[PDB]
């Protein structure tokens, strides 16, 4: 509803860490994909959400 794509994805990753705190592997794996995806910039963040 509001905010930017970069802000949308970054805060979602923080919530994933909080929700799945008993399973740290989920946050680590998602950050691995975003690190490769996020080099392109906002387009890569859109690719990550896709």
């Amino acid at each position: 509803t509001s905010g930017s794509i970069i802000n949308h994805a970054n805060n979602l990753n923080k919530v994933i860490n909080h929700v799945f705190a008993d399973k740290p592997l989920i946050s680590e794996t998602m950050l691995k994909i975003l690190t490769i995806d996020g080099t392109t910039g906002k387009d890569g963040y859109r690719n990550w959400l896709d």
Partner: protein, 51 residues
């Protein structure tokens, strides 16, 4: 000279601020041919003599 590799973001979303207009140097050169020529000849010769 070696070519420069910009990042992939700078190729897609890169913008610059340049004037892109070249003013003529003739008004100074034509009015003062003696002074302008002496200035540039001295500057060049201060470097060529050091080869």
């Amino acid at each position: 000279y070696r070519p420069r590799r910009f990042k992939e973001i700078e190729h897609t979303h890169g913008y610059v601020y340049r004037e892109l207009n070249q003013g003529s140097l003739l008004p100074l050169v034509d009015a003062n041919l003696k002074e302008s020529s002496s200035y540039y000849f001295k500057k060049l010769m201060s470097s060529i003599s050091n080869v």
